[PDB]
Design a protein around this ligand. Sequence first.
Ligand code: 36F
Ligand code: 36F
Lengths: 322, 322
Amino acid sequence: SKYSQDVLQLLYKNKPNYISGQSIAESLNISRTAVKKVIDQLKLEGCKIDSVNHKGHLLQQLPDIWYQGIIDQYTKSSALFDFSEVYDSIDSTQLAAKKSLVGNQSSFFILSDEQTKGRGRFNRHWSSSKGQGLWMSVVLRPNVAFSMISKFNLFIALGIRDAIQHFSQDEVKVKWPNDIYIDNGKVCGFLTEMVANNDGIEAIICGIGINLTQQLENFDESIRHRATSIQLHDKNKLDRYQFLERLLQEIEKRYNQFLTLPFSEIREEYIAASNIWNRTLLFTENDKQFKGQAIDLDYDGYLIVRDEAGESHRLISADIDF
Amino acid sequence: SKYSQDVLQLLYKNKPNYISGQSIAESLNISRTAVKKVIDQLKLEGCKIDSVNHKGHLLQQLPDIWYQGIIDQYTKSSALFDFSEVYDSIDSTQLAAKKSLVGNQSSFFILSDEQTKGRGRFNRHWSSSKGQGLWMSVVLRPNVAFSMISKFNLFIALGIRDAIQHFSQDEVKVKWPNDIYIDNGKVCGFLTEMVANNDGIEAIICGIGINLTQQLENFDESIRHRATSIQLHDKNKLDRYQFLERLLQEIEKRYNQFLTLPFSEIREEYIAASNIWNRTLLFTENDKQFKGQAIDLDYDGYLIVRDEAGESHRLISADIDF
Ligand SMILES: Cc1ccc2oc(=O)n(CCCCn3cc(CCCCC[C@@H]4SC[C@@H]5NC(=O)N[C@@H]54)nn3)c2c1
Ligand SMILES: Cc1ccc2oc(=O)n(CCCCn3cc(CCCCC[C@@H]4SC[C@@H]5NC(=O)N[C@@H]54)nn3)c2c1
């Protein structure tokens, strides 16, 4: 109700310390027995809080639900982002981000527990089941030319990857240009779009879907061989909030690199992180489809491909299948 | 009121024919004396309709106000556009277009009588006074790469120019890349923006401001030497609706050319239409500013400039001053 996030904010702010019902009640100028009432609900909503008499409450562990209130804490103390929007369900964070950026120069991100109408590249359906993954759009505001998009996409990839890795027992690879894998399962897909004109980019909108807490059971049967989740590669439970934290951390890192360094500078690294070498790839281009091999990513972000018929292409993007 | 546009639609549809109050009343299932009531208002609103007893009404001439109802008639019978939005006042058609395009593949345009917060390039203030100019954003949906924006901007320019010319006694020139002049007055400025990602453009948003019905009196005193309007170069009154008509006509023309022809094919023409040759131009680039001369537009839309210090640049865009 009206005060839930508020209570939550305090519980989060105050860690690893207990706070009294009383104390909360005076912050939010409401009754002591209201606070007891707002707590019990959170607990029922799958919050783990320790209540100790004469001592008060301690927010121990959070459920697989995004709470605005907590997110605000991430936003408050952040160079990069002005604010955030958090939903339990929406059509698409990317759609919402696309609307929210109009007419303003803010930087912000959107998060939703479920997306009812999530879309990937080429307007593909992207499956965004409730409480199971991170579905986020990020808006940043680099002052640069529109051509510079592709570079963003490459830098940001390593960002996302590092974040995922740091929680994975196994090797986490990028599949240029838009996809992250753990061994054989796609664990994430992301996409970098812009509003821009000739004078430069007005905004970057970076959509990111990462499967967090799935069982193969939860994955569709017709894709269950090539999909995975972060949880399936961490012996420890996966705290979405801990993970969101590291995700923003590396986004920032890579965002700054994108601004201050040329692609040549991360190219090697990108390379070692990629999983497309030494195997045969099925490219699509509209009606046409063909196989070929990944020769090299050039100093400019372009992939050097040698098609099955021996011809070299230099490509800025492509959709590749294994 | 509730039925104004409807009456208007009929009046427009039926030209050059009179329609009876009766006939209208049965189309729109309302009372005969309501219709008399809805007409008198339109007349007061500065519509010129002929009412003739036993005969009915003829829509003769329209005021300097955009009516949704009429616009719908343009939209209904049009290959290019799905619908349109019409306002008497909004923050910015470009802003609105930017919102309306999200989550759908429509093609459409927006029109407003006044823009309270209209913006040009580099987020400049653009003055959009009530009932005096055409303030429009167009959204089209070409299937192409984002790089292809600049080409759009060039093609569309000739479109706009032809439209203006056809109503001008005097020579109407383009000032690359974003501005239209009649002799010494800026008569229009336009701007081509996109939402896109690496796989291609998701939408083009083309904002267009054209001064229609100004007196130098109406123009600010500190710009009155370099601003003009279409009316100030037509001895005949300027029908915004007649003009909108020709504008859409040529937009379509040039849109198709943009899709079917390489820039080389209109380059010559663009050239003869341009007004930047044989004089000295002040370019701005951020902090830096310098003079130089326009040597050539290359087959690829880029301007060849020779700066005051003898160095050639090849430029995709620039803001030029006279
Ligand atoms: C869930 C699932 C599991 C296994 C799968 O195996 C598949 O082939 N697919 C179908 C997808 C094919 C691969 N692909 C990748 C991309 C780029 C990523 C798009 C960013 C998405 C983010 S989510 C928050 C934001 N809001 C939004 O609307 N979009 C973005 N596009 N297509 C699978 C889907
Ligand atoms: C009215 C006036 C008269 C004389 C002037 O002399 C000046 O220097 N200026 C200031 C402008 C400087 C030149 N410039 C051109 C451009 C590109 C055009 C932008 C499209 C505008 C359209 S309108 C409907 C749509 N909605 C929207 O918000 N924008 C677009 N940017 N800057 C003048 C303004």
